[PDB]
Each structure stands twice: as structure tokens, then as C-alpha cells.
């Protein structure tokens, strides 16, 4: 378990793209983590969800939004949050994709020089996938933990952006 | 299990490329995928489709695909698609190359800035591999799922290069 | 079992990012770090301690972290320590995160040229955890080993720098 | 199983590093690639062979045998051959070199936007490799495959770089 | 088994760096690296031998110790070696630092264009170390393999630097 952590993150842009594969586990995930960054004071308006079919899609689509709001409510994203949920199949296309997913995203992360949460679930069975989307009772939606991490994580690079230490 | 859609790419080029290996199984997936591009509205000429002999070719393949259609029915591609059909063999060849084409493919996406949909099949029997084409009574290809994301990652690349978020 | 070196580093400025998923573990660890650092005569003004929610978090912390001292007490970073600690959980959520940090404190470390001592556990069950930060009685924390590493890494980055062999 | 094609390739230069580790498995593979090379009309002037001690030693040296011909019978190699051969030992030493090389392969040839044929084995006993080898008296040699590869993807390479489509 | 061949090398620079955990494995290998240098023709004042604590630190040490050589017997250093050692331990930690550092080395090689000798043991236990460091009665020093490899690969990427083919 982590330590819980609120910032202001009010002056933040969000950026955030979630794969549709297993949407009654996306949902609840993306419910939880744009619950977390509004609770956070981000604005309703400085969140831009966007989707995509699979996992795969995730870095190339992350890389390209962030690319997008440089090109530009407006301004660069402060961070960014990949939603996703791969489930084993019979076959190792789980693995191979989720292995690259991974790298892909902790690739656009350290290339763009902006954070990017990692919220993409490697599960083995559904009912995993539901316990970790605050599906089932009493169980822990780990989307608020992304929020919540978005947010830390946008602000703390504001000030790296500006040198401070 | 995904939640399809399905886009108006008829603005948009496609780039295909597949390997040969196990083609039996490729042409049901190449079938389908090049149907629901053009159910999609892909004029049939903006579709281009080459192949190589393995799948280790196809991120090398892909790379030079697109990076011609730059230099130039003509204008570089909106969108690629890498089909490729992967089967365990006695050795470890099948995950050396599976890995390697795997990242090979996710890295051309990020270098190039284009997504790659995903289209390699890294299965460990026969029928897998016709399971995931369609082939067998019944069964669901694939195939048509790439079509139908190439279309909308297409879109969605041209907005994202139009700073639209 | 290694070999132990103090070296000079009074003139070095360390920087430290570490996460804060079983902090129970995270601060006897950053504590014998921060310890052998003083221990090697570095000015305690010197050694910034930043943190973040996760490991994943990490590598994009540190790559920043540094990128901020650039910009400028003051003085780029001569090492940078990365301290973590994951757990296998149910499912593949460890593998893949400790894949990902991996390969991307690597990353960042040959990217930016400095020193990023790992200092991050992949262990299976609790106790191994906290055996490893010296938790248990009469158990050697790693984190003191990490601190050393920094110095003397530090010390040797600046003669590299000055082209010294 | 592949699709077999022969393509012109005369007017190709191909460049093959090769490392020495099992040489009675190489030597059979080497020799088939060849054949099929010269049996594709490629000059054997226009044939470069150059070996190595181990396979991790392929990608560099191919990247540096390409390197070399840029430099400059004469003028950049159209396509590459690494062939290698790993065998499981005792140790892990096996799945990290087979592992590194195998990225590090598929880095040249992206890279290098020529293709890199991948031609190393990592099979887990001496039969697999004869097999694989053409050795074993009816076993299909690979290198066959691999010369042939070489020459389709040569002149891929060729049109890509002259924008055809 | 590789075949055996030795070279000039008696104009090449060649840098080495090892880790330190498992000093008694280390020296033995370092020894036998250093000693065919020498058998080689390498001139003593042209070998360059500097230590890191750990394997992790051996890609970006490498990084560094070549780049110092740059700025300046004097003069880029025609071949690296990296040695380590290390051993699985109770956790995955051993996993994770072999295939980071695997993939750290083969970048620094491929990124400078410089041969990196792979003289990393990745073992199980500490016998197995011992026998590939010559150190059991009768058993071969892998080192002596290294020294030779870093011989060969300076002298060919000489002449690759040459343009020769
Ligand atoms: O296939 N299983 C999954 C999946 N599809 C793979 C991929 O994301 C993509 O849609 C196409 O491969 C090519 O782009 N995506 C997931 O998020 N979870 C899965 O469990
Ligand atoms: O070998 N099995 C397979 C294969 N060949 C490997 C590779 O693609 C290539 O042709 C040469 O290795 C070197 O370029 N290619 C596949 O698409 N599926 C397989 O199941
Ligand atoms: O989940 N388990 C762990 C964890 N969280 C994963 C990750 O670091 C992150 O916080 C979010 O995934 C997206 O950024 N972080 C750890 O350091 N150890 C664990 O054992
Ligand atoms: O060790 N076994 C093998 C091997 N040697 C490892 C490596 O290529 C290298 O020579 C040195 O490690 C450092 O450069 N090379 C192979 O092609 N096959 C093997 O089965
Ligand atoms: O821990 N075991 C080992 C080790 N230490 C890990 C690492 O290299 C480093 O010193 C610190 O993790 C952070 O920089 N290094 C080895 O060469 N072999 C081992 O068997």
C-alpha cells in the first residue's frame, strides 16, 4: 500500500487515454481517476479524455495528445495518465503486448519529459481486473490512486520545469 | 472483449504490410482487415499493401514503407498496420522474434509518430492462430478488428497533428 | 558480497528521489543512505531528497530532477539515487512495473551521462524487504550500500568529465 | 512454414557478419545462405563476409561493417545477414546474450533503415541446431532461407529508398 | 565452444571496468582478461582498469571511461570490456540488474560505436561462477576469452573506422 497525497493541482492540464478493451473495468477506472483529479481542483474543462481500441494504442496515442497541446484548455499537459487493462488469454499475446506497452509508455514518459501514470492493469483473471477497479465490494478502485498521482506528479514537474529543487 | 467503432477515414492513406510465414493464416487476416478498411470508407487505391518473408521483416519493412510514401495515391500514411502470425516451434526462436518484432513495431510507432496497429498473431498451436483468423466455423477474425483500428487511429492521428485535442 | 571504498565527495551534490509505496521499508533504507552520504563527508545542504508515489515514478523523477539542477546548492547533480521497493503482488503488476523502472533508471543514467545508483527492491515477500533495509535485527540495510555507491560514483563522473583515465 | 520467392539481387551488396561460437553449425548455415545469394544472381564480389568471436558481437560489428561501406565492390550494403548460434548452457548467460543480441539486431536494422536478416538460432541442444543447420541428413537448412531474405528485402530496401510504393 | 585466434593489437587503447561484488570471482577473471592483453601484443601502459561497486554501474561507467578518452597512452580506446558477476539471489533482484545492465552494454556499444566485450556472468550459484573463472582445479577462465574478443574487435573496428571491408 502507498501514502495518500493531495496537491493543488488546480492550475494543472490532465491529458488522459484510455483503451476501450474491457470497458466494464475501463469505466469504473477512468470514473475513479477523474473523480481523484476534480476532488484535486483540476478544472472540468483542463481534462481531455481521449480513447483508443486497445493497449496498444496507449503510448502512441499519449505521445501524440502531449504533441497536440504543444502545438496549441489549451497549454501543454502537465501529465499524463494511460488507462488500460490486459487480461491472459490462452495465447502470449498478452505478454508481448503488455511488455511493450510498458516500455512504450515509460519510453514516451522519459522522451517527453512528462509524467505519464501508469494505469494500465496486467491482470490474469476478470475478477482481478474488477477488484482492482473498486468493482466489487469494499475493493479498492485504483483509478483514484492515479488521479491522485497525475496531479502529484504534473505539479512536481512544473517546478523541475522551473529549476526549483 | 473491445467496443469497436467505426471512423470516416475515406480522407485517409493505409500502409499494410505482411509477413508470409503460415499464409494460410495470413490471407484470412489480411482479407479482413483490408475489408473493414474499405468498409470504412479507405479508397481502395489509398491502400497499399506489401509484403516480406517473416516477421522480423515486418518492422524494418513498415519503417521504409512509410518512410517512402514521405518522400512522395500519394502522401505519406495515416496509419500501418503490421500483420505477422508468430507460432511456437521446438526452440526458442519463436520468443526471441516475437519480443524483438514486437518492440521493433512499438518503436517504428513512436519514432515515426504513425501509429502501427498491432496485427501479429504469437500463438503456440495451429488453431490459434486459424481461431484468431476467422477460419475456423464460427470463430472471430481478427483481422477485421486492425481494419477497423487503423481507420480510427488514422483520424485521430490527423487531429492530433492538427493540434486538436 | 561487495567491497567497501569511502571516498572524499564533500564537493559532490547527490540527489535522491525515492517512492513511497511501503514507506515502511523506504525510510530505513533512505536513512542509511542519507547516512553514509554525510559519512563521506557530504554537506548535508548538499543531498536533496525528493519523493513520489511510486517506482514507476521514478526514472521520470530522477530524469528531471537532474534536468532542473541543469537550469540553475546549485550545481548539476554529480549522482542520483533512485530508491524503491516492489513487492510481488497477485498479479503480473510487479513484473512489469519492475521491468519498466528497470530499464528506465538504466535509461535515464546513459541518457543524461550521471551516476543513477539503483537502489530498488523486486522482492517476493515483506520480510525480504525489510531484511534487505535493515529492518530485521542484526541485518545489513542496503541502503547504506547505495549512499557509498553515489559517493564514489559522483567522485568518478567529475574525472571522467575532466577526461581523466 | 515460409513462401518461397527469388528476386533479381545482382545489382545488390550484401554484407554478412557471422560469429565463431559452433563453427559446425555456422559453416552449414553460412554455406547455404551463400548458395542461395549467388543462386539469386548475387556477384560474389558483391558478397562481404566478415566473422566475429560471439553472437553479441553481431550487432555492433554489423553496424560497423555497414558503417564502413558507407565510408566507400564499393557502395553502402542493400541488406545485412547476422548469423549466429546460441546454445543453452548451464547458466542463464544463454537468455541474456540471446536477448540483448536479438534487440540489439533489431536496433541496427532500424537504425540503419537497412535490413539486418536475422540469422541466429537459440535452440536448446546441439540436434536442434544440425536441424536447423541442414546437417541432419533430410533437416532443411535455415541459411537457404536466410540468403533468400536477404535478397527480397535488398531490393525492398532499394525501392523504399527511391520513394516507390 | 568459439575458436581461438589472436591478433596485433599492439597499437590498440583498451579500457576495462569491473564491479566489485564477488571480488574472488572478479579477480580471477580480470586476471585472465588482462593477461591475454598482454599475450596480445597490448602494451601494459594501454590498458586502462577501473572498478565500480556493482554491475549496474558497469554500463554507465563504460559510457563514461570511453567518453573521458575522447576529450584526451591517450586516445579513444579501441575495444571496452565489462566485468561482473552476478548471482541469484533470494529475489528477482538478480533478474532484474542482468537484463538492465544486458541491454545497458549492448547500448553503449551500438551508441558508440565501440566494441563492449560482454564479460558479465549471470549464474546460479557460486560454483558455477568459479568454474567460468578458471578458478576450480582445471577449469577454463572465460576472462582469457574477453582479453582475446577485445583484441580482435579493436583491431576490426579499426579498420571498419577505415572504411575497409
Ligand atoms: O488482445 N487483447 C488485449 C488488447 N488488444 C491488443 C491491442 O491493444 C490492439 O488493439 C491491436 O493489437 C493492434 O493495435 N488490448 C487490451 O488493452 N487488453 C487486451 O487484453
Ligand atoms: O521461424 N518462424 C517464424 C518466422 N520466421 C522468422 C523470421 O521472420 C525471419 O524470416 C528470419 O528469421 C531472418 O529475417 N516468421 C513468422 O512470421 N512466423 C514464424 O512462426
Ligand atoms: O503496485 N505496486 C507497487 C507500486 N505501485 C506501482 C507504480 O509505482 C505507480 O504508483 C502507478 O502504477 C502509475 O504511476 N510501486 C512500488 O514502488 N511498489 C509496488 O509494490
Ligand atoms: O557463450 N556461449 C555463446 C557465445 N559466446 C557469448 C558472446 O557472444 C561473446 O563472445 C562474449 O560474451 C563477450 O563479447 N556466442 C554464441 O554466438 N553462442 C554461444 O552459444
Ligand atoms: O546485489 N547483487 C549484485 C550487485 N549489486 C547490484 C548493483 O550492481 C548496485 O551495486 C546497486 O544496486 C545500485 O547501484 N552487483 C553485481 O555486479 N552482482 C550482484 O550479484
Not at 495518500?4 to 470497458?23: F, Y
Not at 483540476?42 to 504533441?67: D, M, T
Amino acid at each position: 500500500g502507498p501514502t495518500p497525497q493531495q496537491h493543488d493541482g488546480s492550475a494543472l492540464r490532465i491529458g488522459i487515454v484510455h483503451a476501450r478493451w474491457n470497458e466494464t473495468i475501463i469505466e469504473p477506472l477512468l470514473a475513479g481517476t477523474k473523480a481523484k483529479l476534480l476532488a484535486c481542483g483540476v478544472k472540468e474543462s483542463n481534462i481531455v479524455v481521449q480513447s483508443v481500441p486497445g493497449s496498444w494504442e496507449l503510448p502512441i496515442a499519449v505521445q501524440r495528445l502531449y504533441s497536440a497541446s504543444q502545438l496549441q484548455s489549451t497549454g501543454p499537459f502537465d501529465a499524463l495518465i494511460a488507462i488500460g487493462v490486459l487480461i491472459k488469454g490462452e495465447t502470449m499475446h498478452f505478454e508481448y503486448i503488455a511488455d511493450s506497452v510498458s516500455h512504450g509508455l515509460m519510453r514516451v514518459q522519459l522522451d517527453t519529459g512528462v509524467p505519464v501514470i501508469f494505469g494500465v492493469l496486467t491482470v490474469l483473471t476478470d475478477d482481478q481486473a474488477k477488484a482492482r477497479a473498486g468493482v466489487i465490494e469494499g475493493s479498492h478502485n485504483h483509478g483514484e490512486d492515479w488521479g491522485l498521482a497525475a496531479v502529484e506528479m504534473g505539479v512536481r514537474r512544473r517546478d523541475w520545469a522551473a529549476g526549483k529543487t
